[PDB]
Amino acid sequence: PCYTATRSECKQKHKFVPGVWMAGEGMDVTTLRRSGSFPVNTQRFLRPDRTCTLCKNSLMRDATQRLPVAITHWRPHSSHCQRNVAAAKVHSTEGVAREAAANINNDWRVGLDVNPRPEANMRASVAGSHSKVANFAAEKTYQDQYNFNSDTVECRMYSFRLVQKPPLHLDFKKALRALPRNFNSSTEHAYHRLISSYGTHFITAVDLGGRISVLTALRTCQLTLNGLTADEVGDCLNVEAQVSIGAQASVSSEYKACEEKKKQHKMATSFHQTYRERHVEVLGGPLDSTHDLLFGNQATPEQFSTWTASLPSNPGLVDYSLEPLHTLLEEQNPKREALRQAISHYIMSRARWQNCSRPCCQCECQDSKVTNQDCCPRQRGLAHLVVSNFRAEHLWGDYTTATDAYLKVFFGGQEFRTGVVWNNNNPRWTDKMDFENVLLSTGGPLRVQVWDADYGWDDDLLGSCDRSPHSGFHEVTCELNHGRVKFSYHAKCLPHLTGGTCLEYAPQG
Ligand SMILES: *[C@@H]1O[C@H](CO)[C@@H](O)[C@H](O)[C@H]1NC(C)=O
Ligand SMILES: [Ca+2]
Ligand SMILES: [Ca+2]
Ligand SMILES: [Ca+2]
């Protein structure tokens, strides 16, 4: 929307249109990072006719500015203001409780009386009682709270393009002079010398404007694990035997003996991980809005208004379009071909492992204690417990006959039973017992209980064993009151976890 000026119009101090020098800049296509290279020279401002293109400045007083020849169409977009405010909140909870109790009581008593007629008497009495109490309890609370939001403001003001015949810069010409004839393995290094110094693509169409971006994340993860165990045993025995004779002669023997035993086991475990990230980017502004805009979650509209009012003087970067470098060479020139091949390969190289920030090169999933949004481990302490190779040695279960024994597995509030072989004093079983995902840390103590099936309302207990689960291919041996029981298990940690009880996170992130 402007024209060519004349000799007198092209005399006084006339600054260039804002942000024009950003045009034609090289940019890596791999990283989308501005290396700061200018394959094209935009310094010239006079056509061979010696006139210059003064162009009026909308949204900037009522003056005119200089248009360089390489520029196609400087459109002063009147006004375009966009805002995008996105938010997201996620909550997750999980709560489990197991409780178990067992009460057992038994009593015994006998009484005998003999009264022979010819001057004789006799009495006897016996008593006894047993009691066992067991209590298991466990609580498991998981809660995760994730939060995200992003506020972006854009204001497009300027935009313009280039042609396919712009004046190439002298330094780029000198680089081309030292550049070899065509492509080869030895000369490819020389191409690298060009690439990092001039990028792979150059800006052909550009749009100028101001921008704010504010990203904020907040990831919190809380684990609480509680476990209680309480055992009581009480055994009271009472014997009282008295014998008297018709002639004065008395004997009395009274026994009393009662044992009490208590066991308590409490274990609390708490994990808390909070990660907060903010990130703010600003491209427009003459170092003036920086006074208040960068800091503080809220910006008052007044300094924002001052920023926008001063914005036309200094533009930023909002959008760009890329043109391959080989487009800029001569139409009849072989060294176009041998050029881009290398770049193409080069691109793919940095696409594979040299630069892998965007594809995830599958990365880790944890915040790594710095940057790296990723994820806290949604499950911790879980293991795939597998119990196998049940065997026992030298039992004494059945008194008259051979031992009829069977085992019970108690873990994490779960009650599990096996098959019973008959009449064996050292049997073993081929059961492949699996627990799927269980918490070893707060599953309580693994109990293996050896019972003797005597077909009665009061079964005979050969014994029991308590062990603390740990990760690895472990073997467990237990000596009973009579006989012994041996077996093994392998409760491997779930991935991203290791250690004895599978709580600590092995890698950095
Ligand atoms: C690569 O080929 C060019 C000519 O095509 C030659 O000048 C250069 O020496 C070669 N480099 C090698 C074979 O390493
Ligand atoms: Ca028995
Ligand atoms: Ca039995
Ligand atoms: Ca038997």
Burial 340-356 (b: 16+ CB within 10 A, else e): bebbeebbeeeeeeebe
Q: How buried is residue 106: exposed, middle or buried, by Cβ count under 10 Å (0-12/13-18/19+)?
A: exposed
Joined tokens for residue 282: 């600003």
What distance in angstroms lies between residue 454's CA and the mean position of ligand 4's atoms?
8
Q: Quick one: fold of 382-505? A: Immunoglobulin-like (2.60.40)
Q: Pick the residue whose CA is nearest to atom 2 on ligand 1.
A: 184
Q: Pick the residue whose CA is nearest to atom 13 on ligand 1.
A: 186
Say which experimental method was used. cryo-EM
What is residue 344's three-state secondary structure? helix
- Any known ligand binding at 423? yes
Residues 198, 343 contacting (CB under 8 angstroms): no
Q: What is the CA radius of gyration of the chain?
A: 43
Measured distance CA(329)–CA(322) in Å, rounded? 16
Residue among 160, 195, 201, 166 nearest 43 (CA): 166
Q: What's the number of CA atoms in the CB half-sphere (13 Å) around residue 188?
A: 10
Q: Which residues pair with 23 in a beta bridge?
A: none
325 Cα distance to chain centroid: 41
Q: Pick the residue whose CA is nearest to atom 11 on ligand 1.
A: 186
Measured distance CA(313)–CA(503) in Å, rounded? 57
- Any known ligand binding at 459? yes
Q: Which residues contact 20 (CB under 8 A, 6 or more apart)?
A: 42, 67, 68, 71, 160
Task: Please report, in angstroms and rounded to a whole number, the separation of the first and last CA atoms in the chain.
Answer: 56
Q: Which residues pair with 485 in a beta bridge?
A: 392, 478
The reply to whether ligand 1 has any atom less than 6 angstroms from the CB of 164 is no
Residues 228, 266 contacting (CB under 8 angstroms): yes
What distance in angstroms lies between residue 326's CA and the mean position of ligand 1's atoms?
21
Strands 446-452 and 460-467, how do they pair? antiparallel
Measured distance CA(234)–CA(110) in Å, rounded? 20
